[PDB]
Ligand binder design. Structure first.
Ligand code: BEF
Ligand SMILES: [Mg+2]
Length: 1118
């Protein structure tokens, strides 16, 4: 019924943000309607022990019990809580279906108003409300059970005469008390461990254990220095994260002035004020967005729901009648088409409204019960607690299993030779137990992620979860939306295909504006088409930019003319000079949806003859046209320009002569609606963003797959994916459609038909074509049927072969994202709208293009509104992955040499040096560790992926082999000095003045200071280590400091260090061992160590198996 004749807006916005798999007194059980949880609400009170003994239990234990028990709450409830009915209690516990306990309290507010204004008796003062994850559960006093929510919002507007009256008096105060403020104000993060737990790496749980081994004043300075640097790193990282989150929240805040009609008067109010029933105003300007989802009462409007739906077309809404209001209920997640036809939705950008007359609208839902609010609230409900720390939760297991062998080796001997039993457990506890992971590791990982976050925030992308920056290196496919993400949210003019009179056919697409200077007859078709483009629009100009129907705005911006005020004075042609005359608009008729056309009567300055210009939809012009001028290719071109996905309008003209021209045009519409001659077509399409095609081409050419998960028509989605590079050219799409009638039954059959051919693939069992590459484009309902009724192999083959997914509700988007992650395929998601919030937290790396919407808990948010941010957040992620492993391969190796630096000292019954270890860990490890992890990516997203496994040979074999080649050279130095006769090695036999200790400390010092350059994996996926300032300067200055310690030691360091005299010849040989270790490690790690790891070496990823299976099956021609 709209102007265009193509794909039409059909997807209503839904609040469902969780996929439900189809299957073919006190302590109640209840299920949230929006997202499936089936929670249990149990109300307890505080017993006669309560927290009175819990407080002193926490005090006398040192506070460890409180920290341990807050993570495991289920017996805290048993210890403290006492079982009472929750009619009169003050403590509640919330249980999910995955057994997670949450503790809340009940607030009580005197109300003193009847039950009809809260539910649906007069004496009601209890208002027991619990806000569990922004779900407001209230207590029904007549019953004894908590209700689901306040989603159903007391409908009392049926009379249709009090609907426009509005609320007055103190009723608004009580409504505000019940339903809360309209703003979706999330709970801001608390600095008391609420945000710190996100940045608290579990390795820090070992760190305090080290303090237990260091609170005995054994290393008085070392523990304080490590605590200082770790606390500083943690504080800066959490402060940066909190500032970024608060900044994103401060542009996430929305408030707009609205003319709320209350008490019979129009008052200007902030947007975060409306409560259900306050009837508000639309028609006045500066209302760029709908404050709360509402119901129309007077006047039509056109709004753009490109964020609550994927629909690019601006949906037009009409006033609701009395029957319309008597059908809806606010508790419905998805509204019917009749209700949605007369309905405004919260957050949608308002495009046009009609001009004391107004476009007054009655708000029905506020707060988190709005569709935007419901999607935002259901985004924040689930939590992947132990998801990403598990990948490091097994490395220390194999590290302690490896060092258990060394501990057994060194304890096989000293247990009987020179050490007793009571003393021997403390040298192992103080030294070996604390260096299972070095204390500098969790303070260097946080510094590395902070450097990555700052490098990203340089290029206009903010990170809200700094722990997610290293996950981006694991991405092998990115999932994209369409409207706002890839293409712009509105329709745009593609070109003009006029109909030539001489050839009786169309001419060419004519993308550029050559309509002005191309003639190719009483009237030229090009001039008439241009006059339709620049004259037929009923646009009210305001501030130079046109406002109104988006099609009219886009054609008026495409022609580039200057429309004057809306009367007998018309527009003027552009005075650039590139003999076309100017034309003025006499009278315009309203666009009648019943007639599906709009007409204007214009008058040109030059010829001074009347013109009638009518544009409407095709397949309605041919029944009101003059058929002699219509081209024979009308239906063929219509099929080509509609079945592809574009939307076209058909314009036509006719000439009113001078004698038929009347100054007072009291002449009816139907006179100029017959006998017109046709001129051509105007095509509307979703223009891609100018950089989207290049980014998709680079991402696809760099071994990263791309799919598209939109929410609009499948034909437009296929056309956009074809012209952006997701589907490679001349590859047939294949749409599944249900046959044999059944569409919601388990025994239905799907025909996978080609989108523009009678050919089809084999039935769902094997997705192969009949007797070359192809792509699969699945709509929404068919995917919902497949995911719960089709076999597992069919679902896997579709997910592997699929590249376009359209008409997808947000719950289906989340289900498809999870089904990618059901197999071991790691997918990110490039969403922007409120549709995307379900599929943004569930994905690993969820980049949010919209700054305000869908960025409340998305791990990334781009300031630039295009796909150019997707490369950096991938490649820097890779630069934040291998570098992290370049710390993991470096720090743990640091542990093992330390054990050798202890173990050989147990040959001479010494342990270590008090000051040499302090110099090693602070003055040489930290300037290597935190400055090795400071370098940006290569700025070229390579096809090969980093080794992202802590189980594979490519990490363990180089690590253990570097450790062994370090032990061999340290043992060579030890045997050398032991048999070196110029200076006898004094075994004094706590003992710190050993010459063996000094000559082994210097060798291990060279080991630590040369192992950082070799292990710095900078060349493939980062900047090369040839960059002198970031990393080479630090290693150079600490190498010069070490050489000053060795070659020319001053007397002052003799007061510090316990060094003894050394010969020049031995010093030279020591330098030779250091340089041969560097040469061996550098030629090994790059050429031989990975060679040995590969030659030393099942459980392959599911996606790869499906790729090989499909490709191989296709080689045999079935
Ligand atoms: F269509 Be989506 F919200 F980008
Ligand atoms: Mg969108």
């Amino acid at each position: 019924d709209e102007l265009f004749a193509g794909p039409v807006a059909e997807s209503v916005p839904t609040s469902v943000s969780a996929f439900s798999h189809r299957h073919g007194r006190s302590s109640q059980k209840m299920r949230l309607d929006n997202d499936d949880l089936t929670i249990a609400i149990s109300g307890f009170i505080t017993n006669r022990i309560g927290f009175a003994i819990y407080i002193v239990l926490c005090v006398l234990t040192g506070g460890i019990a409180w920290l341990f028990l807050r993570w495991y709450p289920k017996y805290y409830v048993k210890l403290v809580g006492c079982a009472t009915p929750f009619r009169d209690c003050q403590w509640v516990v919330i249980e999910d279906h995955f057994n997670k306990m949450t503790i809340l309290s009940i607030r009580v507010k005197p109300y003193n108003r009847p039950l009809s204004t809260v539910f649906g008796d007069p004496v009601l003062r209890e208002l027991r409300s619990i806000t569990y994850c922004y779900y407001k559960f209230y207590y029904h006093p007549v019953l004894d059970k908590f209700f689901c929510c306040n989603g159903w919002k007391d409908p009392q507007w049926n009379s249709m005469q009090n609907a426009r009256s509005g609320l007055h008096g103190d009723e608004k105060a009580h409504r505000e008390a019940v339903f809360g403020p309209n703003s979706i104000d999330v709970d801001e993060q608390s600095i008391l461990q609420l945000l710190v737990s996100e940045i608290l790496t579990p390795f820090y749980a070992f760190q305090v254990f080290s303090l237990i081994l260091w609170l005995c004043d054994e290393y008085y300075y070392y523990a304080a220095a490590i605590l200082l640097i770790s606390a500083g790193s943690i504080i800066t990282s959490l402060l940066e994260t909190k500032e970024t989150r608060r900044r994103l929240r401060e542009m996430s805040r929305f408030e707009c002035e609205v003319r709320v009609f209350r008490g019979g008067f129009w008052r200007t109010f902030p947007s975060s004020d409306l409560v259900p029933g306050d009837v508000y105003e639309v028609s006045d300007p500066s209302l760029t967005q709908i404050p709360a989802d509402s119901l129309l009462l007077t006047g039509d409007c056109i709004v753009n729901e490109s964020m609550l739906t994927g629909e690019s077309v601006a949906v037009s809404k009409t006033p609701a009648t009395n029957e319309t209001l008597a059908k809806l209920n606010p508790a419905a997640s998805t509204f019917s088409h009749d209700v949605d036809k007369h309905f405004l939705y919260c957050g949608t950008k308002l495009i046009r409204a009609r001009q004391e007359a107004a476009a007054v609208a009655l708000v029905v839902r506020t707060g988190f019960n709005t569709t935007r609010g419901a999607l935002v609230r259901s985004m924040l409900v689930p939590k992947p607690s132990k998801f990403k720390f598990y990948e490091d939760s097994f490395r220390y297991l194999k590290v302690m299993g490896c060092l258990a062998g060394l501990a057994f080796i060194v304890s096989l001997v000293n247990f009987i030779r020179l050490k007793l039993h009571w003393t021997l457990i403390l040298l192992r506890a103080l030294d070996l137990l604390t260096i299972v992971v070095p204390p500098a590791l969790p303070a260097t990982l946080t510094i590395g992620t902070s450097f990555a976050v700052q490098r990203l925030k340089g290029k206009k992308i903010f990170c809200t979860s700094p722990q997610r920056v290293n996950v981006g290196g694991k991405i092998d496919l990115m999932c994209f939306d369409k409207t706002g993400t890839l293409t712009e949210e509105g329709l745009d003019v593609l070109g003009i295909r006029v109909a030539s009179r001489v050839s009786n056919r169309f001419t060419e697409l004519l993308t550029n504006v050559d309509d002005l200077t191309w003639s190719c007859k009483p009237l030229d078709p090009y001039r008439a088409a241009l006059y339709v483009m620049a004259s037929c629009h009923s646009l009210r100009i305001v501030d130079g930019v046109a406002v109104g129907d988006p099609l009219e705005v886009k054609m008026f911006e495409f022609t580039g003319w200057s429309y004057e005020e809306g009367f007998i004075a018309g527009e003027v042609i552009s005075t650039e000079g590139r003999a076309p005359p100017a034309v003025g608009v006499l009278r315009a008729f309203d666009f009648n949806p019943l007639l599906r056309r709009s007409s204007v009567i214009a008058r040109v300055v030059g010829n001074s003859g009347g013109y009638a210009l009518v544009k409407g939809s095709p397949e309605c012009m041919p029944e009101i046209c003059r058929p002699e001028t219509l081209p024979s290719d009308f239906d063929e071109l219509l099929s080509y320009y509609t079945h592809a996905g574009y939307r076209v309008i058909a314009c036509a003209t006719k000439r009113i002569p001078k004698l038929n021209l009347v100054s007072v045009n009291r002449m009816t519409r139907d006179e100029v609606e017959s006998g017109l001659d046709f001129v051509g077509f105007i095509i509307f399409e979703n223009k891609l963003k100018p950089t989207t095609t290049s980014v998709i081409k680079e991402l696809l050419s760099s071994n990263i797959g791309t799919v598209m998960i939109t929410g609009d028509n499948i034909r437009t989605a296929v056309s956009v994916a074809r012209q952006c590079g997701i589907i490679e050219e001349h590859a047939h799409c294949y749409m599944p459609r249900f046959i044999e009638g059944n569409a919601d039954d388990c025994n239905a059959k799907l025909r996978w038909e080609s989108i523009n051919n009678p050919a089809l693939e084999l039935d769902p069992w094997t997705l192969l074509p009949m007797p070359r590459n192809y792509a699969i484009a699945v709509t929404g309902d068919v995917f919902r049927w497949i995911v719960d009724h089709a076999p597992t192999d069919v679902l896997h083959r579709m997910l592997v072969l699929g590249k376009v997914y359209a008409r997808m509700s947000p719950d289906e988007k989340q289900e498809l994202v999870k089904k990618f992650q059901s197999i071991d395929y790691s997918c990110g998601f490039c969403g922007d709208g409120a549709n995307d919030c379900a599929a943004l937290k569930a994905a690993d790396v969820g980049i949010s293009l919209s700054e305000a919407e869908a960025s409340v808990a998305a791990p990334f948010t781009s300031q630039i509104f295009d796909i150019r941010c997707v490369p950096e957040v991938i490649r820097e992620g890779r630069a934040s992955l291998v570098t992290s492993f370049s710390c993991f391969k470096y720090m743990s190796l640091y542990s093992f040499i330390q054990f050798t630096s202890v173990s050989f000292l147990y040959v001479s019954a010494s342990n270590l040096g008090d000051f040499q270890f302090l110099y090693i860990d602070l003055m040489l490890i930290l300037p290597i560790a935190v400055f090795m992890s400071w370098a940006g990516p290569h700025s070229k997203l390579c096809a090969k992926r980093p080794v992202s496994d802590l189980v594979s040979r490519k990490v363990l074999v180089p690590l253990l082999s570097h450790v062994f080649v370090c032990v061999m050279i340290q043992a060579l130095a030890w045997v050398a000095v032991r048999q070196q006769p110029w200076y006898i090695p004094p075994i004094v036999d706590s003992n710190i003045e050993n010459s063996e200790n000094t000559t082994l400390f210097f060798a291990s010092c060279f080991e630590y200071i040369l192992s950082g350059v070799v292990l710095n994996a900078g060349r493939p996926f980062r900047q090369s280590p040839l960059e002198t300032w970031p990393f080479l300067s630090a290693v150079a200055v600490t190498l010069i400091a070490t050489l000053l310690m060795l070659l020319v030691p001053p007397y002052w360091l003799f007061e510090f260090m316990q060094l003894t005299w050394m010969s020049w010849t031995f010093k030279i040989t020591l330098i030779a061992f250091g340089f041969v270790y560097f040469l061996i490690a550098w030629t090994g790690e790059h050429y031989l160590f990975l060679w040995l790891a590969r030659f030393l070496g099942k459980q392959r990823k599911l996606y790869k198996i499906v790729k090989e299976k499909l490709v191989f099956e296709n080689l045999y021609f079935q």
